[PDB]
């Protein structure tokens, strides 16, 4: 069974068997987390596991609303979006529950990446090495992360489509396949329809396909024709204009041998560049670069048309930076395999010039080093082929150096090499015991909110929670996973981190002015608030918000809920930082002392962050420095508001909070202690003239304005 | 790691 020769085999039957083996491997491998997570009651809702990224709930809401057939005007529902639409088709066609579909779609489609990997490897007559490369590429660390079961997001096809476009270019370079004239464009359309940001990659790849053609095929008409078709496919023409052009030029080139004169096709290239230009061309690329590569704060380019706001970019986990070890493991699950993968890619390049067309994705992935870990994805499959090529290279050496190796033994050697180098990805999967977005309890709290509040109501929360609340509670939010600029975040920051009188004034004013801005398009909503109540600056208006005798000339059009969950505690300083920023200034106002940590054991308490709590319960020890406490607040009931305020030092400024119900400690300053969050959630102290308590739980509180 | 959520 093993003595036979697999390397030379490139048959369609063999490649189909290999695709099936690798696809089944990819699915099976992302089934372990389902097996693990299913044993915890905390992860279920409606008899199924929950989604596993915040953003999935955005498409999940959208899918739900397409199924229901409507949404409300100006909830920012992903109604009609691509992943919502594919979810809706599959839901209407299949017998499985909605939650199961949303759980498993990524597990299926991300595994399709196995197809183009080993078909590209096969175009070079390396199908078996393609098979190994597809195994590695399908479960490599960062790719797995954003496509595991429950990662119900757009990442699940975001390399499959570009890899199929690459395969398309390869087949054109090797066989001059006329069917490329059709597939290259169609795939770009699908990619552009599935992930509009894909524009940038498409623009780069198409661009390179031109330069490559100016070099290696400077005379072949089919390359110029397919370039014109692809640039058209990049444009904003209606789908029928695009497809009409594509099919027209395709038939005319396919069935005419007198064909299309060369001047005509250069004319087509010009018409194309004009059309794509009218469609906005290259601007989306410079914008995305502006946000991720240049990390600008004011990205909409409004000097004095807006106020100045804290920059959310340095706040999102996806966009956080990464050191070289982690970059390499994200890409290859291991430094060794990464080095060998890179060598393999060089050798593959300096053997198949066409693999040059993979450079955009490679470049995009490496761009992670500047633009955040979320980009390494783009380098996984390219680099995986590189590793495949390295293996082909290695055994090639072993024959060009006449090494005496049986077939059975060379095959045992290959299986061993591939298994030993694919191990790190499996380890990562095993350890990547990710958990649900929320707990059953929070999804339950928000669904009960659904049955309590109205569809046209707002809940003020932090933007992290915008998608899950809108999914579970079917309400409106101020900010969410895709609407979370400084200018957007300011209102929720203020409501949650300032005192209650102005927090409620701001909750009413912000919800009302957001609703108005749907009809009025304020470039800055805070600026609209200011320039309505006849104030001179942001600080001026916000400080005028402090008056218990405040006139409210904006009428009430809905209820305004405030969602205050326990899990926000640990990011309270980050939330607070947004309203800590003088909008007239961009300047930080107070210093913000905060951290939450767990006691270790039970004589001097140490806490995770090295902060020693005094035996006295009267001082802390940060970085060798002992700092006095103003008070030790020992909180036994978050819901009852039963707590014990122990005075220590009227002259000091730091508070220590003990959460018995969580066995956790909080270290904060005076400014944060009085925030709406710490008071209404932890201590259960709220002005009953300003809010009504709607839900009171140890894990979350929901209040309503009045 | 790969979440469109807050950290810090
Ligand atoms: C449900 C939900 O809310 N989802 C939200 C989430 O989703 P998202 O990540 O998918 O959207 P995105 O952040 O804009 O994607 C940009 C990621 C790219 C890889 C594409 C473009 C990035 C570049 C850096 C351009 C690079 C240019 C090239 C030409 C490639 C070649 C480069 C080389 C060679 C160096 O984030 C959004 C935040 O606003 C929201 O809108 C969206 O709603
Ligand atoms: Mn996402
Ligand atoms: Mn709705
Ligand atoms: Na349990």
Author numbering:
A (entry chain A): 2 to 603, 608 to 711
B (entry chain B): 10 to 17
Paper text:
N-protein glycosylation is a post-translational modification that is conserved in all domains of life. The oligosaccharide is first assembled on a pyrophosphate-lipid carrier and then transferred en bloc to conserved sequons (N-X-S/T) of secretory proteins. The reaction is catalyzed by an integral-membrane oligosaccharyltransferase (OST). X-ray structures of ssOSTs of Campylobacter lari (PglB) and Archaeoglobus fulgidus (AglB) have revealed the fold of the enzyme.
Here we present the X-ray structure of PglB in complex with an inhibitory peptide and a synthetic reactive LLO analog. We chose 2,4-diaminobutanoic acid (Dab) to replace the acceptor asparagine, because Dab-containing peptides were previously shown to act as competitive inhibitors of bacterial and eukaryotic OSTs at physiological pH. We used the reactive synthetic LLO analog ωZZZ-PP-GlcNAc, which is chemically very similar to the wild type LLO except that it contains a GlcNAc rather than di-N-acetyl-bacillosamine as a reducing-end sugar. The key difference is that the two substrates are closer in the new ternary complex, with a distance of ~3.4 Å between carbon C-1 of the GlcNAc moiety of reactive LLO and the –NH2 group of the Dab residue, representative of the atoms that would form an N-glycosidic bond if Dab was replaced by Asn. Whereas the lipid tail of the LLO analog has an indistinguishable conformation to the previous ternary complex, the pyrophosphate and GlcNAc moieties have shifted and interact differently with the surface of PglB in the new structure. We now observe continuous electron density between the pyrophosphate group of LLO and the catalytic Mn2+, with the shortest distance (~4  Å) observed between Mn2+ and the oxygen linking C1 of GlcNAc and the pyrophosphate moiety. The structure also revealed different interactions between the pyrophosphate of the LLO and two essential catalytic residues, R375 and Y196. In the present structure, the N-acetyl group can form hydrogen bonds with the side chains of both D56 and Y468. The Dab side chain reaches the catalytic site where it can form hydrogen bonds with three conserved and catalytically essential residues, the side chains of D56 and E319 and the main chain carbonyl oxygen of G482.
